[PDB]
């Protein structure tokens, strides 16, 4: 049956990379991203509309602590569907290098922001684990690929683990 999929990762970890590919390859999947959907109230609505059509839904947000993820777990329970999770394991170094690549942040005294931003997220980042009392069915950790782009095989490999 259909299921809700939580992406969890630092800025620049590759969450959009992955979720975009998934929805491209699989038409029974939809993607909730705030850069495309705006407010959270709006994201919740879309999420509800997709579950109403028994579609799978993937949540492209840092989802950096229990509170952030609950929103979606809560909606999933509403439609009696499970919630799995994909944690991107890319480290502060990797993300930092990716964020510099984009060169769209102020830079100089008071630091290069974006590295700052990353640092702020890092300090509030609580990924799901065995112990957190959240009601997630399965947590899979995903390591970075050599390739900047996400292969169909990579998507398949992830989905194959529930
Ligand atoms: N090598 C490698 N680069 C990746 C991977 N995932 C994403 N990237 C790159 O990292 C950058 C940030 O990815 P993006 O999806 O925007 O990150 P998000 O901010 O977590 O949604 C982009 O340049 C991607 O090409 C991965 O698995 N491996
Ligand atoms: Mg993104």
TrEMBL record:
Gene Ontology terms describing biological process:
DNA repair
SUPFAM superfamilies listed in its UniProt record: P-loop containing nucleoside triphosphate hydrolases
Entry-linked InterPro entries: P-loop_NTPase
The GO terms describing molecular function are: ATP-dependent polydeoxyribonucleotide 5'-hydroxyl-kinase activity; double-stranded DNA binding; polynucleotide 3'-phosphatase activity
Q: Which Gene3D superfamilies match?
A: P-loop containing nucleotide triphosphate hydrolases
Name of the protein in question: P-loop containing nucleoside triphosphatehydrolase protein
């Amino acid at each position: 049956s259909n299921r809700v999929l939580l992406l969890v990762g630092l800025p620049g970890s590759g969450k959009s990379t992955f979720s975009n590919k998934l929805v491209e390859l699989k038409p029974n999947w939809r993607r909730v991203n705030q850069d495309d959907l705006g407010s959270r109230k709006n994201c919740e609505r879309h999420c509800r509309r997709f579950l109403e059509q028994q579609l799978n839904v993937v949540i492209d947000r840092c989802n950096f602590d229990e509170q952030q993820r609950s929103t979606w777990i809560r909606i999933a329970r509403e439609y009696n569907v499970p919630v799995d999770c994909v944690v991107l394991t890319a480290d502060k170094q990797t993300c930092g290098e990716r964020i510099l690549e984009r060169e769209d942040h102020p830079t100089g005294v008071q630091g290069n922001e974006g590295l700052n931003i990353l640092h702020r997220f890092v300090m509030n980042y609580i990924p799901p684990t065995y112990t957190t009392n959240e009601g997630i069915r399965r947590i899979i950790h995903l390591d970075p690929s050599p390739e900047p782009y996400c292969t169909p095989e990579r998507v398949q490999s992830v989905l194959a683990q529930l």
